[PDB]
Each structure stands twice: as structure tokens, then as C-alpha cells.
A paper describes a structure:
We report that [name]-[name]-2 infection elicits a population immune response that is mediated by a lineage of VH1-69 germline antibodies. By cryo-EM, we show that it targets a semi-cryptic epitope in the spike receptor-binding domain. Binding to this non-ACE2 competing epitope results in spike destruction, thereby inhibiting virus entry. On the basis of epitope location, neutralization mechanism and analysis of antibody binding to spike variants, we propose that recurrent substitutions at 452 and 490 are associated with immune evasion of the identified population antibody response.
The bound Fab adopts an orientation perpendicular to the spike 3-fold axis. The unbound protomers adopt a closed conformation with RBDs in a ‘down’ position. Through HCDR2, R1-32-like and R1-32-related antibodies can bind all known spike conformations, particularly the RBD ‘down’ conformations, and in so doing expose RBD, or disrupt spike structures.
Residue numbers in the entry:
A (entry chain A): 340 to 580
B (entry chain B): 14 to 70, 76 to 339
C (entry chain L): 2 to 214
D (entry chain H): 2 to 228
Amino acid sequence: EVFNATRFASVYAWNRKRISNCVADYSVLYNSASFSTFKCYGVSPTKLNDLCFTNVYADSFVIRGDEVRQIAPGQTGKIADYNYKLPDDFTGCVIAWNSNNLDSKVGGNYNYLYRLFRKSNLKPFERDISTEIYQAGSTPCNGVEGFNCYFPLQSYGFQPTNGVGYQPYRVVVLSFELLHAPATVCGPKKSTNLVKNKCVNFNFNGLTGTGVLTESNKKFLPFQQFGRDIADTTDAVRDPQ
Amino acid sequence: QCVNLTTRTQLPPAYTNSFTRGVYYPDKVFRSSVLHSTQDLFLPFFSNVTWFHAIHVTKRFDNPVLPFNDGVYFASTEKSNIIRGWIFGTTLDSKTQSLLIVNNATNVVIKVCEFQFCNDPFLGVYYHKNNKSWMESEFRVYSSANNCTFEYVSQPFLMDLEGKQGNFKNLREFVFKNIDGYFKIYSKHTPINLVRDLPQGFSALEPLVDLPIGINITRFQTLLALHRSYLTPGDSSSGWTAGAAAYYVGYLQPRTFLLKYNENGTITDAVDCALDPLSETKCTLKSFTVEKGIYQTSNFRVQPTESIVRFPNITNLCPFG
Amino acid sequence: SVLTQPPSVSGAPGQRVTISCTGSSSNIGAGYDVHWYQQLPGTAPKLLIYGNSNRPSGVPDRFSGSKSGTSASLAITGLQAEDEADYYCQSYDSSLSGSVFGGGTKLTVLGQPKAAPSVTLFPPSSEELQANKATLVCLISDFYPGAVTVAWKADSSPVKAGVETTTPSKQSNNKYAASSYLSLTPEQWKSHRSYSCQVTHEGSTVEKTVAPT
Amino acid sequence: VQLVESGAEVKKPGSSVKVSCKASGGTFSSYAISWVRQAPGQGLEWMGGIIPILGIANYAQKFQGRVTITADKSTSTAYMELSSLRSEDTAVYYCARENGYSGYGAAANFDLWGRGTLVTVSSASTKGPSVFPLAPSSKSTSGGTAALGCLVKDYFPEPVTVSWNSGALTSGVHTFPAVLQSSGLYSLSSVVTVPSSSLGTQTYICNVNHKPSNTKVDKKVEPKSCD
Ligand SMILES: *[C@@H]1O[C@H](CO)[C@@H](O)[C@H](O)[C@H]1NC(C)=O
Ligand SMILES: *[C@@H]1O[C@H](CO)[C@@H](O)[C@H](O)[C@H]1NC(C)=O
Ligand SMILES: *[C@@H]1O[C@H](CO)[C@@H](O)[C@H](O)[C@H]1NC(C)=O
């Protein structure tokens, strides 16, 4: 629902989702063949499922086609410094794709907003929903649309008949946390084809033995995982598959 | 919220004897045609165990705060599902991580939090006039809760809310252990037809789910449920009923036990090593059959009870620094 | 919906009374601030505390708000004569794409001692009978508190049709009063021998009947 | 500032409702304005918030495309349009104001609220009310007091106020609330305690005003002759 929904939010108030007490596989998110741009710093895009972390912070918002290059640490612009700042130690994983067939319509889709003016910079990982009129001079205006007072929040220009560099791109960032705590969500070991009657090596969560897997004729009780024998040797392990 | 009770007459608890009770699976592996012994927390056979009554016909209602040791044995020949659940904790003042494992009529709730446990939390079953069924309405277990982390829901289990005064037809055993902070629950239902003086039958106990709470438990207390029929005025002061129930509270001792495994893989017999010299020889020889002969089980060491340490004709002090 | 609250909380006038707000890990535990409101039955709700760190103008400093991980807490000290309202937990939810409120807890003292009731049974007039309807009224007044169970009977069977009870309101002398109607027809009004409304109040049953003939 | 709203308003089950939100003073054309509802029985919901500067609609996913909120800059007001009403729309709406800030949370708070608009929709629409007199009998008057009044039936909608001799009677008056019947109808009553020594020299009349129906009945009250 974070990816496929009926509508999204803006950049001044974006959706914040936390993944806790869950397990997922990042292999389906790589072979989708539907994303436009895919950048992932801090870790390789193909070896991030083995090593896992404590928490996963995912934010979803909309952005134009010419601003997808601004989501990176080490540059200054208009959106990456007033809406969402990227720190130096940013080990995130950004994913973007083009879905102009849902967030655009004839007549002009101006549903989402953005912040253009701001007094100063902001600390990264901080949301700004201040709708106060940014004063550029030294005299008050009592919130009027006259001189020396402009509204920072401005509308969009989304149109489904545009080109490529000005289309609404669904951009998401998957950040990881590193603290003194167990992994709330971790990348699990992938399964492998089942093979028997051959000299294989398996690791069924409690041992790493080398041998064959013959079909037994005895059924175990549905509360055990391993099995010993008379000679005190674990030679019967239930397959969790 | 809870209410206070009134001072009335009660019955003192009695002391009975167990007959081959308190045997469970000490591991999660499969064994067959092997005589292996381990060192776990089991119940010694032919030991003195406490006995508490819960029948009405009078007004027997005792629920003391018993200290929770390393491994307990809670056996109850339940008939009409009177006992609902059990609580755990150290001081019960919303200061530690208390436990609440209750078995309601909808689903099992295992919520380890900091609930406000009162002096005597008890369940209440009221009998309606229009509907001829026993329904639970007085849910007086705790007051409130501020913040919690752990929350787990077990599988749904159906229960009977009607209480009678007949003989018991089932037997349920509960074993609660705490090692590495992990909580172990061993439960298995066994039909039996007896009111007291449990037979010499044998029945194993299989675990269901491990609860890694990682906390220390030193006290425990069982919860009882009463019925509110038309015979009682409906006040929980001096007029109530509890049906008929009998639960046993035993403390598991760290004694080694020799288990027997058949071809199916279930426990058949249990042999101790610190109870009877015959059982000690049987468990040391690793055989359930002993022929004629002499054997050696252990040694006999007399521990000294006194220590005479003295130094005569001598003394002095030291100027340190 | 996604935010649950206890239905009621008990307290004493002079001790500390706390409440808890529990939700999910995407609306309150994600990092969003919580906002507490007070819903007084008879005026519009106002702002009490925002962000659990600042104090608005016009609020006392007895309210304390804190966020312990994924749950928010509100603690008060001293129960005055203005806390007979409901407290709600409001947080911004991303799955709902907007702000969602909580359940609401009631915290008030009934202060409702018992009192001896007095009933009045009035038969319908002659002008009401040609309107093809019969409104049997049964007025109760001068009682305390306002919790009266109203029952009807026609000397052979209880009436389980057309019975209505209204809520009692406070009088000028700190009393309560209510009325109960019975919608019937004038064709069956004269066939039965009598009518009566039976009520109870802490076991006290007062019975009054009339006769149409 | 202070935000004023309209009073009570009833409509038909399946028609459009037209309410408004007025603002006294300023600070209305610079901050966002939302609408928060409240119904007895459940919690408080949030339909959506509208910005008056850019004129951009922002609703929730739980509400479908059936309500539209507009804004005006000439007189600084806002209107609410909702058609195809249901049986659950009996609630009250509030005209709130939002004031954003900066921080790690950055949640929408409601610092300024409105008055309230009671919008109740049901069956048994507006019709002609009927008042019936009530007089005591010889059995109901055992002491030196009497009980009589006027009964109001088949009246709609609320509110309806009763009066005695154009407000000339103050002591001993009592107004009873309404109630929901099986067909969506209300009923009230009012009785006054008066001595029996004035039942033959002074008459008691009831004056009922109904501004939604523009009707005012003036009926007479006389004691019964058979009892
Ligand atoms: C794993 O899933 C398969 C199919 O979904 C099931 O047959 C098997 O019993 C599961 N193993 C478990 C739950 O341990
Ligand atoms: C034990 O296994 C034997 C044969 O292997 C079987 O006949 C018997 O029914 C089993 N006992 C059980 C399942 O209780
Ligand atoms: C000191 O030693 C002498 C001889 O060894 C003994 O008789 C005497 O009792 C001792 N005094 C003590 C132990 O105070």
C-alpha cells in the first residue's frame, strides 16, 4: 500500500512508515524491470539481504522528473535543503519509477504542494509543516498578499502530456538504523532446491553435518526438530519445508 | 478495579502425596530405544506436596501469594473449567514486568506488562434471567496500564462456563520454568475419573510455545472464578459459589531422572537417582532391569559442622600508614 | 479505528490520575507528535497541549504530556469541578492519510444519591380520541437520581410495544423529572378494563391505575 | 480570533446540505482550514482540510468523492456542500484552524475551533403540529394543588419552546425533553402546579412557537365536568 495506493502525500508532509516485527526479501524489488532510476549508497544493491539492521525507515513522496538527481548527499538546491536534507552519513537506498497514469489528469493536477521559501537551513531527517508567510524584509504584513510577503507553499505543474524530465516520479527511500539492539526486521536466508539421496551439506539451524538424506518411515511428534539415537548421534532432523 | 472481601471462616490446607507425577520432555530431540538421563528440574516421587480446595459445600476460597521457585508443578483435575489463568511478578505494585496468562472464553491472552494487580484479582460469571447461559461479565483482573512492549496472542480455545458439583472427568497439568529468562509451558489434557489421591498412572507433558521474556520471576498466584446465580444476592462479600475444583502446587527440585523411550518416542517411565537406592542403582547402571550382584552408586562424605580455629598465648595490633 | 482507549478510568480528588494512548508503529510510534483534546458536553473543544513540550496560553500547568516510545501518556494532579469531560488521543496517521482521533475516556462523579419518587398517571382527553391515536402518558417527578425503569401492564399481560423513556433533566430544586408515552389506538383503548404504568427505584415500586369507564 | 457557524439545520435523506463558516476579523486567509466532525457513540473523524491561499483540496482516503469544500477571498468565508445523505450523518461539524510549526514530529494541530452546526437527518419531515389540552380530575386533586398542562404531539423539527400566558408564569413551570419514536417523531410535555382556588377565576393557556414551520397555535384548557 506504500507503493500501490490511490494517492500520495506532498513533500512538506510525507508518509512515514516503520517496519518492525516483520521479514521481507529484497530480491523481488530488484528484478521488477519497472523502475526508472535506482541508486543505493552505503551498501551494494545485491548484497544487502545477508547483512541486516535494527529498523527500516521508509518515506514516500512525489517529485518532478528534473529533481530526481537532487536526492543525494553533497549538493545544494531548492528542494533537498528546504524539505528533506540528506546528511553525510546517509546509507539509504532510493528507488524511483514513473507512474504518470495515476497522479496526472486533464485540466491540471495541483493536488500536491511543496515549500519554496525558508528562513534558514534545517537538520536532516526533520519534517517542516510551517505555513507561515516568509518575510523578506523588516516590516510586518499581517499575512496579506501584498509587498514584502510571499507564500512559501506553491502549487505544481503536473500534466500527463509533458515530456520526460517534468513528470511526477514516485520516489521512495529505504534507510537503515544501527543501534544497540536486535534486528527488528532482517533479511532471511533464501531457500534452495530440495535434494536427497546424495552427499550434501545442510545447516538446519542447529548443526552443519555432511551426509545423505534418506526417506525415513517413522513420523515424529509435532514439537521436536532434531533426533538422536542409541549411540548419541543426531541423525534425524525434521525438514522445516 | 477490585473490591475487598470480608472476614469469614475458611478451611486449612492439607498435605497429600504424589504418585509418579511431574514428568515432561527435558529437550526437543527425538529418542527411541535408548536409556539416557539428564539433569533438569523435575518433581521427586513420593514427596510431600500441598493441597488446596476450591469447593463451596464451607465457602472455601484461598489464593495466597506463593513464592515462585525454579520450576513449579501445577496439576488440577479440572472438570468445569473454573480456574481461568495465572499471574506472575515480584511485588505487584506496577513496578516490574508482571505476567498475565489468562484463558478467556474467546482467546488466550498472554500479555506481559505492568498492570496494576490488586490484592485478589478474581473472575466473575453472572447468570442472566432471560438467557439460560453462564456469561462472564465481572472482568476484574487489573486497573490500567501506561506503557508496554511485549504482546502475544495464542491460539483460540473453547471453555465451559457452567459450574456443577459432580465428580471430575479431566486432568490438566501445568509446568512453568524460567531459564535464561525464557518461559516454558508444558500442558496436556488427560481424562480421569477420581476426586483425590491421584493414581499411579504415567503421562508426559509436551510444550506448546516458548516465551522469551528475559525477566526474573520470584512470586506467582493463581486466579479463581466464581458464579453469580439466583441463590446468592449477587455481592462478593459473603455469598458466592465456586463449584468444585482441586489444584496441586508443587516445587520442582534439581534432580536427575532416567527416562524411557519406546519405538514411538514417548516417555514411558521415570527413574530417579536421589530418592531410592533401588532407583539410584537402576539409573546409575543405565538399565531398567537389575540382576543379582553388588554395585557402587556414589560415595558417603560427612560434612564438618564445626570449625575450631584458635591461637593461644598471642596478640598485637598494627599501625598502618 | 487504529487508536484504542480505555472506556473509563477511576480516580480520587487529590491523587495523580494517569491515562495511556496506544496505537500502531506508523502513526504515534513513527515519530509524529501527539495532541490531546478535551470534549466537554455542551461547548466546543479547545487546544490543551501540542507536541508534549510547549504550553499554550490559557491552560493551567497541571497537565503533563509525555511520549514513552510508541505510547503517549497524560498525567494530572488534583481533580477540580471542571474535569467532567472526555479526553481524546489524536495523531497523524500515514495509512489513513490524515489525522485520526482516539476512543475517549469518561472521567466524572455521578454524585447521585437516592430519593423517593412520585408518579402521576394521566388518561387521554376527549379531544385526543378522534385523532385515531391514543397517547398514554406517565409522568415521574421529584426523584434522585434519574435512572428509572418504566414498565406497562393492562392487568393481564405486560406491554412490550410502543414503550418509550425520555432522559431526565435537572430541575431548579436539584431534582429530576421524566415522562413515558404509550402509542395506542382508541379502538382497543375502551375494550380493556384498566391501564397502569409500573416503575421501580431501588426496589421501591409505586403503582397507579385509572379507569376509562 | 473567533469563528462563528450556523445553528441547527435539518434536511432530507438524499438531498444536499448548505452550511457556511464565517470568520470575525483576520487570520483566516493565511492558514489552512479543516472540518472535524463528532457523533455521539463513536470517536471524532476528519474529512479533509482546504487551504484558502492556493485553493487546493485535500481530503482523506476513507471519505469518497461526495463532499466538496470551497473558500472565498472577497468576504473570507467557507462553504460546505454534501449531497446524497445517509442515516449516519446525524452529527455536528466544526470549523477548525491549523497552525503548522517545525520539529521532528510536525503534526497537524487544531488550536482554533468553531462553534458547531447540528445537522440531523431522519424521516418524519416537517408537518403540522398538534397540541392537546390536559386537565385534572376529582381523584388527582386530593390536597390544595392541581396539575395540568398541554401536550405537544407530531411536531418537527427541533427546537420547540413552550410558554404560559406569554411568559407571565415563571414559578412552577417545567419543560420536558423530546424522544425518538419508532417512526422518527418527537414528543414533549409541560405541567404546572397551581392551587385549586384559581381554577374557576383564571384560565391557563399554552402558546407554542415554531419558527421552522411559522405556525403558532392558541388552544384553550378547561377542567373536566364528569370528574
Ligand atoms: C512452511 O510452509 C509450507 C507451505 O506454506 C507448509 O507446508 C509447512 O508446514 C510450513 N512449515 C512450518 C510452518 O514449519
Ligand atoms: C506406536 O507405533 C506402533 C507401530 O510402529 C503403532 O502400532 C502404535 O499404534 C503406535 N502408538 C501410538 C501412535 O500411540
Ligand atoms: C595461655 O597458654 C597457657 C599454656 O600454653 C594456658 O595454660 C593458658 O590457658 C593460655 N591462656 C589463654 C588461652 O587465654
